[PDB]
Design a protein around this ligand. Structure first.
Ligand code: HEM
Ligand SMILES: O=C(O)Cc1ccccc1Nc1c(Cl)cccc1Cl
Length: 402
């Protein structure tokens, strides 16, 4: 009996850190905005696989971001045991989404990000000082990719970096949890820690976004204490797992495309466009694409019914050849404008301009200070995270001329 299905298992796992999974190239090539898939629990959902349709559906308020909905298209059991906790604004819809998001936007403006350049540059070069002084070989993830954005986001939040061993471990356990119990434990660890931080700010008002939320909105009853915890937790985790993943994956990708990496080193004005192309090409955050319909939506002759889960797969939409000519070619010189790596619409990544600053500083610093950087193992020996979490590698052995 043939095993062919019209609802393939989703998500798929990468076999090469920067290439579309084989099942995804098939979804990309099949006409139409939507395709049926089967999720880990056997439930069918839709995936959005085309670029303009993805923008349309991310902008449609009939596609709710509410994870507590029984029909939300969960791709693993990660959140099934944490539903008794309030959602951060990533899981809220208007009007609640905006009231919560607006409590945080002041920390992420273009002006604030510009003012953060000296701090980001100091942090990047400090961790490089230490890594290069110890000599090769090193794990780029633990020694550079993770600590840099962790220190930066901690200062933005008012989270003391002295606790980094504890919160970096809990963050990893939650983001990469494979069972509901391990996710619950990691989330509880972070929640109790952040709750104590709130009490400390109530005793001694202090700097950072958490301190600002405690002194203002919490003291006015405009955010619940547990919502503050969830918001701080989202910003802490997103603030260091996403950039760390982009750093390690960009290094792997650039070293696999040496002609472009050399062109990048010779003309640093190409760095901002290279970062956009790497964001498009590596598209690390498909796990942020889930939505649930609260009303019927007709999409080019296909019908999303109320109550159906829909996943906007931005990595596949970013390989739409009607937008990016030869979409599977890495080209740091191409226009990667309009990519969906950060989403689109009211939920478009709050941290996107901090991420862009960090990646530009990081790439320029690696080229300046470690021009002989190379991988210490073959690419095929790296262990890639599965499609049920943020894409990337947990370890990246590197060497250089000592
Ligand atoms: C480094 C590369 C990054 C990528 C690829 C990425 C990806 C994404 C995506 C695709 C979304 C959309 C979520 C949705 O539509 O449901 C999102 C939202 C969000 N991201 Fe980023 N992100 C990155 C960096 C960051 C950083 C550094 C922060 C800092 C805290 C951050 C904080 C957030 C927040 C708070 C949201 C929710 C926005 C909202 O719901 O209004 N992200 N991210
Ligand atoms: O959403 C998941 O399954 C993993 C997870 C856990 C805790 C906090 C955030 C995330 N995911 C996540 C991250 Cl780390 C960044 C941007 C968007 C999303 Cl959905």
């Amino acid at each position: 009996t043939p095993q062919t299905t019209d609802a393939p298992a989703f998500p798929s796992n990468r076999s090469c850190p920067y290439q579309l999974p084989d099942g995804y190239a098939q979804l990309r090539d099949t006409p139409g905005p939507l395709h049926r898939v089967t999720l880990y629990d056997g439930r069918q959902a839709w995936v959005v696989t085309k670029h303009e349709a993805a923008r349309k559906l991310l902008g449609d308020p009939r596609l709710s971001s509410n994870r507590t909905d029984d029909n939300f298209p969960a791709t693993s059991p990660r959140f099934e045991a944490v539903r008794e906790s309030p959602q951060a604004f990533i899981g809220l819809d208007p009007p609640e989404h905006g009231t919560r998001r607006r409590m945080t936007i002041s920390e992420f403006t273009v002006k604030r990000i510009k003012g953060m350049r000296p701090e980001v540059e100091e942090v990047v070069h400090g961790f490089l000082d230490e890594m290069l002084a110890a000599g090769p070989t090193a794990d780029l993830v633990s020694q550079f990719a993770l600590p840099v954005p962790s220190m930066v986001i901690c200062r933005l939040l008012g989270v003391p970096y002295a606790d980094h061993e504890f919160f970096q471990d809990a963050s990893k356990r939650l983001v990469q949890s494979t069972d509901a119990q391990s996710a619950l434990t990691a989330r509880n660890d972070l929640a109790g820690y952040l709750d104590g931080l709130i009490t400390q700010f109530q005793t001694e008002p202090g700097a950072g976004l958490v301190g600002a939320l405690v002194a203002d909105q919490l003291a006015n009853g405009e955010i619940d204490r547990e919502e503050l915890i969830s918001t701080a937790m989202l910003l802490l985790i997103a603030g260091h797992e996403t950039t760390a993943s982009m750093t390690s994956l960009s290094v792997i990708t650039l070293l696999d495309h040496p002609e472009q990496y050399a062109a990048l080193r010779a003309d640093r004005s190409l760095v901002p466009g290279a970062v956009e192309e790497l964001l498009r090409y590596l598209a690390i955050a498909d796990i942020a694409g889930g939505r649930v319909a609260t009303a019927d939506i007709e999409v080019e002759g296909q019908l999303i019914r109320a109550g159906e889960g829909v996943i906007v797969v931005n990595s596949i939409a970013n390989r739409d050849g009607t937008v990016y000519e030869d979409p599977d070619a890495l080209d740091i010189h191409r226009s990667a404008r309009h990519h969906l790596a950060f989403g689109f619409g009211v939920h478009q990544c709050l941290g996107q301009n901090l991420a862009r600053l960090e990646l530009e500083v990081i790439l320029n610093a690696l080229m300046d200070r470690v021009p002989t950087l190379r991988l210490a193992v073959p690419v095929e020996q790296l262990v890639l995270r599965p499609g049920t979490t943020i894409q990337g590698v947990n370890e990246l052995p590197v060497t250089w001329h000592h």
